Amino acid sequence: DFAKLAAAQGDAIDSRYHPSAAVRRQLNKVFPTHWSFLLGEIALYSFIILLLTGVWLTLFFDPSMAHVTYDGVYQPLRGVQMSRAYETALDISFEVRGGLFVRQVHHWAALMFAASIMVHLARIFFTGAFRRPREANWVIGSLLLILAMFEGFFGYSLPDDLLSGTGIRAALSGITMGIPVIGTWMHWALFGGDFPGEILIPRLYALHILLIPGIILALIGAHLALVWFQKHTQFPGPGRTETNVVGVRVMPVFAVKSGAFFAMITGVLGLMGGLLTINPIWNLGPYKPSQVSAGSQPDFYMMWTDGLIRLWPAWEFYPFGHTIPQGVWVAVGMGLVFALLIAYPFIEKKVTGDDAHHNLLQRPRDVPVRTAIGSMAIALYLLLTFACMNDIIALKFHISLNATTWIGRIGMVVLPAIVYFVAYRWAISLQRSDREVLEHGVETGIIKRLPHGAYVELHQPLGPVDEHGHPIPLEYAGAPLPKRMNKLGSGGAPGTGSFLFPDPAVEHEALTEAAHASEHKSLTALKEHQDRIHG
Amino acid sequence: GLIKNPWKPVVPTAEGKKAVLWTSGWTPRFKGETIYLARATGRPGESPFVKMRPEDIDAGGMETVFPWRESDGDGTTVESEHKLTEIAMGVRNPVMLIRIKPADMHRVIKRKGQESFNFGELFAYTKVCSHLGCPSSLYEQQTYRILCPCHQSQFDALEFAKPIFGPAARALAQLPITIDEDGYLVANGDFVEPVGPAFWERKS
């Protein structure tokens, strides 16, 4: 008797808030169905899991530098002098049922967040989804990326182990006291004295759990609101114009897909956090100034910054009894890639002199210069990332450690140019690949062997034919083209039935008839709509 | 409330109050003070720092040493328990002591003011990298090279620890050493330059 139950609780809501038209509008919103548009939500689904795991790791952690003696369950560190933060981090992993699993899922989700953001950024850049009126959204996303990087960096510095301590001494302390005028003032303001201090871990904890996630949440909210009210772009195709959206309604197709995708992302993250080990802090020790190991690697989203330090030469200046260290060059450099990233749309708008309120995307093959620039940037990023782990590559692969530095140093000026050239040529060649099929047709891969001994290939025209049998040339419309005959339906179903036993013939015939008729109806509907639009 | 003056005299030495960055654990607290080169041997409850002799380290060895005074010691009580912790957590405290083979003693170059900073074939250098402060402590005893595992800068032990590769531009600091009347290793004063990474108002 749920018909009477739902009819009563529906009237109670409409008589008090009257949200009929307002929710009816939201149930009818149309969203394009392209795989590439699912890249953005993964990050979102990664953020939520980072919040649930962040609340479960807030019931057991104690951020303090007060030095203690362990005397716990883990025997190899029995009697060692550590801090309260490190001891509590060991307690989470060894004394609480399922704590190791939770913190492993936390770290894995942290990695997925950054990876997803990078892929989403690549998608947005390459398809020209930033042009107009979607510049502010690009800017917001850029700020989100920067905040995500710094949020991640402050996270693994909390356990206060040897790796994180060595990283934070070199990055946050060494670089800080190199800035020309405000070098030592800023250092003493941040640390409240010399490097180790007694307030750094509490400050980082308060910064990591409260402030940066709050700013991230606000910015994400703004991002999603802008996307919702600016009517997501689409791609060129049959029935697509500058002033419409083609896809499916929110209720019920879109919501089910979103829920299923969230479930599968959660499944993958949970499965990955049990079978693979990440961040074993017990194999390390408590941070000591007079101790170090061989690796010394930050997380992959911070690797390019560390690799830039390793490759830049030792150039310093000494004016009037002062010092300008090497570390300055990176601090200027690091903030120069950011500035060039946020204000890219304006640069391109000024260069090409185009601002015409675009709603239709671009295929990367159609814009060679932008594609080449993106490829060059990706190449530089990859080289800087692989330069940070030049000591691990030199060990596992037999190559000199001195040789890797020079390889990277020379490469960071040579490899981008090669990538630019190759990308440009490749894009133009992919363009030329499309003009061959609009003019001659799809090559079926069949040879004919005419009576007089000539070999020809059978082509399948994509449009009307001429009186001589040669196809009428078609125009390019910014849409993909078929290149295989199997994708055009040159192949039926093997037969209705199970994997081992067939079904009665009549069922198979009826099902084939229905499917074929449904395909006719869909194509006809699209064609009719496209014909009525352009009258 | 979080703005502090870094160049404020807070550290008591043999010359009055001085700023933090000009001092370390090797700075004399009064004239004629004896600072011993100690090594980390045992557990925190078993006298973690003990004295050392020139006979202990042989040719092609290296040891890490810390500044230890007679005024601390054992760490049995709670008064010397917080004094032995400050020594081990000091930013600019650790020192590497190396012994050079007698065969290679003819190829040593001094640093114009540090011509008497060694006791025969024993040398002592700072263990803190002059680039960003990592413990540059990978000592290759045949090639005589000191390697930092952070940014791959190596220093030449035969010369005055001057850089030969990597992003380092300055040489490591040297500590003068000698022996005590009993036969233990002691210092002839602190470094004659600041140790660790650089900053804006460094050098003359």
Partner: peptide, 26 residues
Amino acid sequence: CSPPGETASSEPGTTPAIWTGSPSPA
């Protein structure tokens, strides 16, 4: 640029004297 105050020498240098040590804080 090269760091001023980082120079090699050609001076022999003497063996350090035995440490005596002033007894107590002055």
